[PDB]
Swiss-Prot record:
Expressed in keratinocytes (at protein level). It comes from Homo sapiens. The modification Cysteine sulfenic acid (-SOH) is found at C216. The chain holds residues 2 to 282 of 435 of the full protein. Its EC number is 3.1.3.48. Substrate binds at D182, C216, S217, A218, G219, I220, G221, R222, Q263. Tyrosine-protein phosphatase which acts as a regulator of endoplasmic reticulum unfolded protein response. Mediates dephosphorylation of EIF2AK3/PERK; inactivating the protein kinase activity of EIF2AK3/PERK. May play an important role in CKII- and p60c-src-induced signal transduction cascades. May regulate the EFNA5-EPHA3 signaling pathway which modulates cell reorganization and cell-cell repulsion. May also regulate the hepatocyte growth factor receptor signaling pathway through dephosphorylation of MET. This is Tyrosine-protein phosphatase non-receptor type 1. It is found in: Endoplasmic reticulum membrane. Changing S51 to A/D: No phosphorylation.
Amino acid sequence: HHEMEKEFEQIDKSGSWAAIYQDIRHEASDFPCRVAKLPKNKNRNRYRDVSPFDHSRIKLHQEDNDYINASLIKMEEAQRSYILTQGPLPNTCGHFWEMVWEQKSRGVVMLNRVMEKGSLKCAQYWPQKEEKEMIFEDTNLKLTLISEDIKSYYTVRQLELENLTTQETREILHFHYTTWPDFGVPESPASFLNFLFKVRESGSLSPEHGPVVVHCSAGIGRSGTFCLADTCLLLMDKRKDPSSVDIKKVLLEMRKFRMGLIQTADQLRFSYLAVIEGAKFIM
């Protein structure tokens, strides 16, 4: 039994977020990342210090080079899986969609804007115009924009992904959270939570499909907040006593699948806030 809310207020009052966060960084498990560090894969990694562990990395179905900086996070008790990956690089957009195709994912969750504070955070990996398809010649995939629905805090697009070898097509939902602040974290978790609920209602997180693909720039900070909040809320609804859910233990378990999830104390505090408010709204 825990008291997340009381604990939260106490950490706030004592100014202990950095200490709490350091405990998590120190207790986090480590696993080999040999494939990610191979010389041939250097240009497939956005950041030299953010790599997928070998045990949980997603493998592309190709003989030449099966590497992509993406990780499968499987939450057993919560019964949910997610693929967390970095924002596509100019040379890995074809790989990204190859992964979406091979894993039979129904949705992609994007938590960054292509350009933020004058810095390119990821490539423009989907077409912005319906009449201008995108062809990924290296992985034999074509992507066409079917619809775009822009809302205040996020945009939902439907994309048609076509396998150029077989002509089979699939529709992918792209849920783009477009308002994460340039500095810090959102002051209120309301919009983030509403976005999470839209993704849940979309079927993108359902077991009838391959795992949702979630990304931000590195695929560990904002992406970690999204999956941590979702899994914690899933556990609070499942268990007999929602107060028994330990957010720190849940984060440590997710970190066994991808390193560095939650990159700052502010993101850890925001994750707590989102789970606390999301729990209330749900119950």
